[PDB]
Design a protein around this ligand. Structure first.
Ligand SMILES: NC(=O)c1ccc[n+]([C@@H]2O[C@H](COP(=O)([O-])OP(=O)(O)OC[C@H]3O[C@@H](n4cnc5c(N)ncnc54)[C@H](OP(=O)(O)O)[C@@H]3O)[C@@H](O)[C@H]2O)c1
Ligand SMILES: Cc1cc2nc3c(=O)[nH]c(=O)nc-3n(C[C@H](O)[C@H](O)[C@H](O)COP(=O)(O)O)c2cc1C
Length: 363
């Protein structure tokens, strides 16, 4: 089984290729990591396995979901350290995903009820609705388009959060540059309508992600930095007129950052939509273009994960929903044991146990 051949992720010796995909679960009450998160990640951790946390806020303005953890306060760092410790006690490697939602927020999530920030002043359309703290769905508001000073300060928030992640003991961080959130609002020409140096050309649209990656690379080293993008996913009105060219432009800049810094990133992580042959060809095109480790994600199964590694399409495969309902997903994939179904109703609830840590292990 190629998913259980060892893999050298730069500094990190992995024993298998089954990765926990980053997943917002909303149990980090008041943006503070809680004991429940420790139980949840420990349940899923394996010796030599790689885990990526839920998206974690880099600043007071970066959230668009209830009760997501941050890593911008000293209190959050102290609580994260307890979770990293129980994961390292199992011999796993764990990265913290740094997440800014940009315009995908609401006054209820913003300090002083201020408008969310973005590349643009245009709202997400009412084709999409935001999960509210009371479990209803609300309307995305008009964001505020930020200037280049403010852009530089958001980059500094990524830099400081990366340093905080290292202080909590994380092995590294992942830049969330996917799914129509802040970075993707700069990348995608369906969102970025700017006429300054961060808008227009493909090069201009890639400037923000380039500066974010350069900042965290300079702070903690490239081998502790992963980057996640989704050029072909149109979530929250995040379409681009040429997804493959956009993805190749990002990949070229990642390659150049590595050559200039003299070190490889931990990995590039791409999520695909689930045309099937065309989507697979676009993922392989990005993989072939990138000088380093490639993590594929989106709709993978045991069979599709085995094929991806066996055919050279990816080095690692991340699993989201199947890891929600199978704490021992790695062992089940190893044994080809039947997998248990997941319950979407408890993906984003606040209960520390129900639908979070009470999915059973194999008997
Ligand atoms: O002028 P300016 O915009 O370059 O101001 P700059 O502040 O000297 O450089 C802008 C960014 O691009 C990096 N960089 C410089 N030369 C590069 C190259 N040949 N390839 C890849 N990255 C490079 C720089 O890293 P360093 O400051 O670490 O060289 C910095 O992060
Ligand atoms: C409930 C839930 C929360 C998620 N939260 C995040 C997140 O915070 N950051 C992120 O990059 N992806 C997030 N994702 C996307 C997953 O990382 C992953 O790409 C997707 O679930 C993989 O597809 P799969 O579920 O079929 O394995 C989330 C997915 C789900 C279902």
């Amino acid at each position: 089984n190629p998913l259980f051949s060892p893999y050298k992720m730069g500094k990190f010796n992995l024993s298998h290729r089954v990765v926990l995909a980053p997943m917002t679960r909303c149990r980090a009450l008041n943006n503070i990591p809680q004991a429940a998160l420790g139980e949840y990640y420990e349940q899923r951790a394996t010796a030599g396995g790689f885990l990526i946390t839920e998206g974690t806020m880099i600043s007071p303005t970066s959230a668009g979901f209830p009760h997501v953890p941050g890593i911008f306060t000293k209190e959050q760092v102290r609580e994260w350290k307890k979770i990293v410790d129980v994961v390292h006690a199992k011999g796993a490697v764990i990265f913290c995903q740094l997440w800014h939602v940009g315009r995908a927020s609401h006054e209820v999530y913003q300090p002083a009820g201020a408008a969310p920030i973005s590349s643009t002043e245009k709202p997400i359309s009412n084709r999409w609705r935001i999960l509210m703290p009371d479990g209803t769905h609300g309307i995305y508001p008009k964001p505020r388009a930020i200037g280049t000073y403010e852009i530089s300060q958001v980059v500094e928030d990524y830099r400081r959060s990366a340093l905080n992640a290292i202080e909590a003991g994380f092995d590294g961080i992942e830049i969330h540059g996917a799914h129509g959130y802040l970075i993707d609002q700069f990348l995608k020409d369906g969102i970025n309508d700017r006429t300054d140096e961060y808008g227009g050309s493909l090069a201009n649209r890639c400037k923000f992600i380039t500066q974010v990656v350069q900042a965290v690379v300079s702070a903690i080293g490239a081998d502790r930095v992963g980057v996640r993008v989704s050029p072909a996913i149109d979530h929250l009105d995040a379409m681009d007129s040429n997804p493959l060219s956009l993805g190749l432009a990002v990949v070229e800049r990642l390659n150049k950052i590595q050559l200039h810094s003299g070190s490889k990133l931990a990995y590039l992580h791409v999520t695909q939509p689930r045309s099937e042959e065309e989507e697979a060809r676009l993922m392989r095109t990005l993989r072939n273009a990138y000088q380093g480790t490639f993590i594929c994600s989106g709709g993978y199964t045991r069979e599709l994960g085995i094929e991806a590694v066996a055919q050279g399409d990816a080095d690692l495969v991340s699993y989201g929903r199947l890891f929600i309902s199978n704490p021992d997903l790695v062992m089940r994939i190893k044994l080809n044991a039947p997998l248990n179904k997941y319950n979407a109703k408890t993906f984003y609830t606040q209960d520390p146990v129900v639908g979070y840590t009470d999915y059973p292990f194999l008997q």
